Design a protein around this motif. Structure first.
Motif, PDB file in Angstrom:
ATOM      1  N   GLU A  29     -20.472 -12.701   1.055  1.00  0.00           N
ATOM      2  CA  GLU A  29     -20.290 -13.782   2.021  1.00  0.00           C
ATOM      3  C   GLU A  29     -19.068 -13.540   2.897  1.00  0.00           C
ATOM      4  OE1 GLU A  29     -19.861 -13.841  -1.066  1.00  0.00           O
ATOM      5  OE2 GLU A  29     -17.927 -14.741  -1.584  1.00  0.00           O
TER       6      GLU A  29
ATOM      7  N   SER B 225     -20.447 -24.683  -9.156  1.00  0.00           N
ATOM      8  CA  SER B 225     -19.386 -23.678  -9.253  1.00  0.00           C
ATOM      9  C   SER B 225     -19.346 -22.750  -8.039  1.00  0.00           C
ATOM     10  CB  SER B 225     -19.551 -22.865 -10.537  1.00  0.00           C
ATOM     11  OG  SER B 225     -19.461 -23.700 -11.680  1.00  0.00           O
TER      12      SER B 225
ATOM     13  N   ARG C 162     -18.975 -22.082  -1.144  1.00  0.00           N
ATOM     14  CA  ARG C 162     -18.102 -21.091  -0.525  1.00  0.00           C
ATOM     15  C   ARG C 162     -18.611 -20.712   0.858  1.00  0.00           C
ATOM     16  NH1 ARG C 162     -17.799 -15.751  -3.889  1.00  0.00           N
ATOM     17  NH2 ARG C 162     -17.804 -17.213  -5.655  1.00  0.00           N
TER      18      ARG C 162
ATOM     19  N   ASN D 138     -17.283 -23.014   2.857  1.00  0.00           N
ATOM     20  CA  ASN D 138     -15.909 -22.557   3.026  1.00  0.00           C
ATOM     21  C   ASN D 138     -15.837 -21.393   4.007  1.00  0.00           C
ATOM     22  OD1 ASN D 138     -13.135 -22.437   2.580  1.00  0.00           O
ATOM     23  ND2 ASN D 138     -13.354 -21.030   0.849  1.00  0.00           N
TER      24      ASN D 138
END
Lengths: 363, 363
Positions: B183, B217, B224, B227
């Motif tokens: 990512e 998680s 993420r 994010n």
């Protein structure tokens, strides 16, 4: 109190964004103190030895012991609200030919065009000003626009403050000019919509220690460590924060929650350790994280020790501060229920603020 | 093509007088596994495709006759056999590409499509002028509506129009790279597009990231990728020639904080086509394939209402198989074929998803 009275007054932010740039508004009672007509040209002298001339106007809601003033002059002067100011009446000196050029930063030296008679001639009407000043003409369409910044290299009459009348010749060179004066993009308390009660309440907390710590810490109160903001974020949170920092004169330090989480062992802690390391020199300063809830939401049901070490690293850095060169860490989130209460105790943010949303009045 | 010709420079087949399938561009359309030298190996594989048929059936030895070096040639098929033989190497990722889709290739709806002119193209041409106008348009928009229907093609349309190479980031593309924890590279694709700027970054079906992972998680309850997307927005601006384009089936379920204004601003709705648009998009498909107008294009429009573009683009595509023209099972285009396709094609039987859009979009 803001009280200062008579021909000598105290500077207070205008309670309205105002239509005009030179508008400095005073009540009938306040006007009777200096004995001058409404809209009169009065040169006001202040601290740092920086001067300016403005027009009088009126609310009915003011108190004679203050001055409702433009942000142009305060920014040009660099004044922090609360200074005692000296104003007096002076007859008008007028320009003949005026030269104007925009500042380097705003344009980047990429800007040129037409509109000398569109901007200046329409702004040519009745603007009192100090020579060697950054004068702003707004208009047209919004959302890319805050004012239009023109710095004054010269006015044909020199070494005099002058009002801009209708008989003066105007010039736009579009070549270099001094950048010393800030871009209005760097905020002013006026840029905060409404929230007058919340503005002063928050401001007095950070201001007084950041102004003179040596009593407001020593002989009074105690300096807090950080402040958290609540309500919908991304609208006033990032703006208010820098709107607290820029006006108070305290340097602003930018943090990003997602950048830290985007990082890991090393850079994650290095950054938080790097910023405060930079803060020590600029201290006292303003430290801000809009993303507090993202980095430290932890309610127990997060996982890694990397996220626990960096958030615990944040815990250590708070207590490691001396409260002498004290710096203020600010934070923001949509709701307090989400964030972690282990950040709520002394040693770190003990101070929480609730910012609501506008109303028919707030808008 | 310019590298292959160097290996055509190493072959006396001839080109530009020979124009044929062996034209190097048509073969270049097949391969992204490779780079310049891999083509040298490829032509060696193609050159070896020749020797393996030629030399063995000759059964050569130390004597090499001249006739073979004369009568022997290199056909177009051996390239295909070399192209179908693959050894993909070059970096795992999605690469910039320029499609042919344009206003000519999109029947769509002019009303929502017309908005794409001012949404993308205009900001691309004049980023410096909006500063003069004092305007800063949005950072991107978000498409939502019926599944399929060509919402993915709508971005490929503005892609060729923008005269900038195009990258499509689709949910499955991130997942395959996610398992490798790439990512960070998915974010690098955006920094990569910047070095390639102007280029269009297209986030497709971004609601497809969360559904498989529930809440686990990721960065914590928020992904993420979110994010990475939050940080992806930190780098870009309205200033860069790169344009973010959201496309989503369910622009709610995941984490609306990232969908919040300032991240993805404009909320744009793709409505299902209507009788006329159903006819227009239909005319675009039928013009390429041979047509016997036994059907009345307005009549099959009478039968058809409540069918989205997906069903239509599939119906136009599905009935083509039922019909047979230029081979000897042939049955020409007739309402019978579109009649039998009416039963095969699935209508829109859910007005629920349709009313969630209309109710939410209206107020």
């Amino acid at each position: 109190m803001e009280s200062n009275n008579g021909i000598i007054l105290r500077v207070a932010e205008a309670n309205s964004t105002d239509p005009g740039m030179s508008r400095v508004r005073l009540d009938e009672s306040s006007r009777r103190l200096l004995d001058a007509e409404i809209g009169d040209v009065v040169e006001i002298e202040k601290v740092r030895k920086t001067v300016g001339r403005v027009y009088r106007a009126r609310p009915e809601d003011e108190n004679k012991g203050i001055v409702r003033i433009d942000s142009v002059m305060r920014n040009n002067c660099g004044a922090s609200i609360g200074d005692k100011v000296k104003v007096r009446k002076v007859r008008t000196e007028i320009a003949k030919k005026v030269t104007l050029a925009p500042i380097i930063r705003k344009d980047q030296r990429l800007k040129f065009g037409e509109g000398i008679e569109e901007y200046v001639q329409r702004a040519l009407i009745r603007r009192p000003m100090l020579e060697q000043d950054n004068i702003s003409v707004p208009g047209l369409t919004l959302a890319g626009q805050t004012g239009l910044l023109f710095k004054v290299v010269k006015t044909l009459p020199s070494k005099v403050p002058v009002e801009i009348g209708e008989e003066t010749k105007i010039e736009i060179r579009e070549e270099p000019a001094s950048e010393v004066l800030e871009e209005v993009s760097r905020i002013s308390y006026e840029d905060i919509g409404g929230l007058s009660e919340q503005l002063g309440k928050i401001r007095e907390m950070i201001e007084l220690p950041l102004k003179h710590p040596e009593l407001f810490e020593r002989l009074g109160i105690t300096p807090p460590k950080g402040v958290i903001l609540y309500g919908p974020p991304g609208t006033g949170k990032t703006l208010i924060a820098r709107a607290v920092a820029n006006e108070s004169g305290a340097n602003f330090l930018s943090i990003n929650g997602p950048e830290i989480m985007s990082k890991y062992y090393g850079q994650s802690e290095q950054k938080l350790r790097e910023i405060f390391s930079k803060a020590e020199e600029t201290a006292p300063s303003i430290i801000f994280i809009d993303e507090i809830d993202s980095i430290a939401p932890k309610r127990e049901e997060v996982q890694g020790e990397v996220e626990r070490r960096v958030v615990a690293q944040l815990l250590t850095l708070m207590d490691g501060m001396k409260e002498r060169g004290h710096v203020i860490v600010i934070g923001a989130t949509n709701r307090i229920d989400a964030i972690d209460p282990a950040l709520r105790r002394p040693g770190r943010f003990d101070r929480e603020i609730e910012i609501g949303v506008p109303d028919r009045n707030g808008r | 093509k310019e590298i292959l010709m160097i290996h055509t420079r190493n072959m006396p087949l001839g080109m530009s007088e020979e124009e044929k399938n062996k034209f190097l561009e048509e073969m270049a359309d097949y391969t992204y596994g490779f780079v310049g030298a891999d083509l040298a190996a490829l032509v060696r594989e193609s050159a070896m495709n020749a020797l393996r048929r030629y030399l063995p059936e000759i059964d050569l030895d130390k004597p090499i006759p001249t006739e073979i070096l004369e009568k022997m040639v290199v056909t177009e098929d051996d390239f295909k056999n070399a192209l179908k033989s693959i050894e993909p190497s070059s970096l795992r990722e999605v690469m910039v590409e320029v499609p042919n889709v344009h206003w000519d290739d999109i029947g769509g709806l002019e009303d929502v499509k017309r908005e794409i002119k001012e949404t993308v193209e205009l900001p691309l041409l004049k980023p410096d002028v909006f500063k003069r106008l004092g305007i800063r348009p949005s950072k991107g928009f978000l498409l939502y509506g019926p599944p399929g229907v060509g919402k993915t093609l709508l971005a490929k349309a503005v892609a060729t129009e923008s005269n900038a190479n195009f990258i499509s980031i689709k949910g499955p593309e991130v997942l395959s790279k996610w398992v490798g924890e790439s990512e960070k590279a998915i974010r690098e694709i955006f920094k990569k597009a910047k070095q390639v700027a102007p280029a269009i970054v297209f986030l497709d079906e971004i609601d497809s990231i969360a559904p498989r992972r529930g809440t686990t998680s990721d960065s914590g309850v928020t992904e993420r990728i979110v994010n990475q997307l939050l940080t992806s927005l930190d780098g870009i601006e309205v200033m860069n020639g790169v344009v973010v384009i959201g496309a989503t089936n369910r622009p709610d379920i995941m984490d609306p904080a990232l969908l919040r204004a300032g991240r993805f601003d404009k909320l744009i709705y793709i409505p299902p086509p209507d009788k006329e648009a159903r006819l227009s998009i239909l005319k675009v498909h039928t013009k390429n394939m041979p047509l016997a107008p036994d059907v009345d294009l307005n009549d099959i429009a009478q039968r058809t209402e409540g069918y989205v573009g997906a069903d239509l683009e599939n119906l136009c595509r599905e009935a083509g198989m039922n019909a047979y023209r230029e081979n000897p099972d042939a049955t020409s285009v007739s309402q019978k074929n579109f009649l039998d396709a009416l039963k095969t094609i699935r209508p829109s039987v859910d007005e629920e998803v349709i009313k969630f859009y209309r109710t939410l979009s209206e107020t």
